[PDB]
């Protein structure tokens, strides 16, 4: 078992593990759907329109 799984090391129980050898959780990129339109609400508000909701 050890051969099959354990990482080959020059030192049992190292005091610190390199970033390469530690399991890193890598989530997928997070997409966001921006609700507002930046310019449109400026144009409407300057007109006199009073937005809500």
């Amino acid at each position: 078992q050890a051969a099959v799984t354990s990482t080959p090391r020059a030192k049992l129980n190292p005091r610190n593990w390199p970033s390469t050898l530690v399991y890193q959780e890598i989530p997928g990129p997070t997409t966001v759907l921006l609700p507002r339109d930046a310019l449109a609400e400026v144009r409407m508000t300057n007109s006199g329109v009073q937005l809500a909701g």
Binding site: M44, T45, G48, V49, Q50, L51, A52, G53
Partner: protein, 50 residues
């Protein structure tokens, strides 16, 4: 404007109202989402300052 009124005793208001266009468009695109767009043409509620 310069209204001329009869001089009664007790203090009174004038309550002048300018007839304007005020409307609203209510758009509800998604289940549970309602947004409204107000507009009052001659006497606008909001402007660049607001």
């Amino acid at each position: 404007m310069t209204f001329e009124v009869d001089p009664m005793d007790e203090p009174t208001l004038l309550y002048l109202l300018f007839e304007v266009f005020d409307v609203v468009r209510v758009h509800q695109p998604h289940r549970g989402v309602i947004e409204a767009v107000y507009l009052r043409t001659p006497f606008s509620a909001g402007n660049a300052t607001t």
